[PDB]
């Protein structure tokens, strides 16, 4: 099951709040073929798209949880199915998205037949992200409270979890070399659309 | 596989513009409200209509229907676009007034889609006078649906003309006006792109 007709109508309208030409960050958690958290962020206006997805492969999700995003499988079951394909399907034509690790984002977009969406790959030096990582989580951490489980670096060293949304803001900071301060930052997607509503008959 | 893609839904929205919300409109179906296999929404004044198909969950009961009413081939329904029934109904104009022969199943069908706003006019009829135009309709407008290949018989094993959702809309329209419609133009707003499933796509 995916988005109902009405939910798709809603999404269509909300996506109008996206500037087709504005510089836009995109980041995902989970593999390209089985994402669990998607973030699309426009720093110029502070508008972003942040939502979740239930992973097919749960074994790989726990590994990625222990090694990367530290997300709980319990929080993702209530996620609205099909949302990932609808959002990417709803993106403006020929949009240029900035990202880190374009390889997987390219596959994700290609799987959705969005070969029109070009990608600017922007890689962050460890020290550049090291500097802004803490600062972004403090200011904007209230936006995502899904990364509760502890994450571990090599040698069993605890580190800060990776959030699709925080990643975007951190990437924006480090590439622009300054913490971006936008008075208003908000998710265009309502809670009603990010998470499952009541089960409905589909014919 | 799952249902309509985003682009499809965007297309359906535009094509539904062809439907006049305030025009008299017929609706009929084949299969039960909980497991329909043919849907027809018909506007006689302009010949604009919505005609599409669906694959049944219950194949066994579908064969009983194929024997006794609509005579549709299960092979022809495999290639039908899934989720289309829910999409078309969700795309119908608000508070639209529909007419039908036996509003029972239609109510439950529309109710199961939270479309209680849509009103149903139960055009009850003789089922004899309501079918005097049956032969005449299939004659003039039989080319509108060739999904009914199977032989249909009554409980007495005597052959009868198959029941078609689209053709029924036209038959009931005939009986409701005491004359066969002279539809100069006809138009199924749904293209073949939406009626049938396209190439498989990764859906996340
Ligand atoms: K047709
Ligand atoms: Mg009928
Ligand atoms: Zn997050
Ligand atoms: Zn038919």
Swiss-Prot record, chain B:
Result of changing residue 168 to A: Decreases interaction with host IKBKE, defective to inhibit IKBKE kinase activity and IRF3 activation
Site feature (Important for exonuclease activity) residues: 105
Superkingdom, natural source: Viruses
Residues the entry annotates as binding Zn(2+): 38, 145, 148, 164
Localization per Swiss-Prot or TrEMBL: Virion; Host cytoplasm
Cysteine-cysteine disulfides: none
Chain segments annotated as coiled-coil in the UniProt record: none
Residues reported in the UniProt entry to bind Mg(2+): 28, 30, 168
Residues annotated to bind Mn(2+): 28, 30, 168
Domain description: The N-terminal region is important for the cap-binding activity while the C-terminal region contains the 3'-5' exoribonuclease activity. A CCHE zinc binding site is present in the C-terminal region and may thus contribute to the substrate binding and/or the specificity of the exonuclease activity.
Function: Encapsidates the genome, protecting it from nucleases. The encapsidated genomic RNA is termed the nucleocapsid (NC). Serves as template for viral transcription and replication. The increased presence of protein N in host cell does not seem to trigger the switch from transcription to replication as observed in other negative strain RNA viruses.
Similarity section: Belongs to the arenaviridae nucleocapsid protein family.
Record note on quaternary structure: Homomultimerizes to form the nucleocapsid. Binds to viral genomic RNA. Interacts with glycoprotein G2. Interacts with protein Z; this interaction probably directs the encapsidated genome to budding sites. Interacts with protein L; this interaction does not interfere with Z-L interaction. Interacts with host IKBKE (via Protein kinase domain); the interaction inhibits IKBKE kinase activity.
Name recorded for this polypeptide: Nucleoprotein
């Amino acid at each position: 099951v995916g988005l109902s007709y009405s939910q798709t109508m809603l999404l269509k309208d909300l996506m109008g709040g996206i500037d087709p030409n504005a510089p836009t960050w995109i980041d995902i958690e989970g593999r390209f073929n089985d994402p669990v958290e998607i973030a699309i962020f426009q720093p110029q206006n502070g508008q972003f798209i942040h939502f979740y997805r239930e992973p097919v492969d749960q074994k790989q999700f726990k590994q990625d949880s222990k090694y990367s995003h530290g997300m709980d499988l319990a929080d993702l079951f209530n996620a609205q199915p099909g949302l990932t394909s609808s959002v990417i399907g709803a993106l403006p034509q020929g949009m240029v998205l900035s990202c880190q690790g374009s390889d997987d984002i390219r596959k994700l977009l290609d799987s959705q037949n969005r070969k029109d969406i070009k990608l600017i790959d922007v890689e962050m030096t460890r020290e550049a992200s090291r500097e802004y990582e803490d600062k972004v989580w403090d200011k904007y951490g209230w936006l995502c409270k899904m990364h509760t489980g502890i994450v571990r670096d090599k040698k069993k060293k605890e580190i800060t979890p990776h959030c699709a949304l925080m990643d975007c803001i951190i990437f924006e900071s480090a590439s622009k070399a300054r913490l971006p301060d936008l008075k208003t930052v908000h998710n265009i997607l309502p809670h009603d659309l990010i998470f499952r509503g009541p089960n409905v008959v589909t014919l």
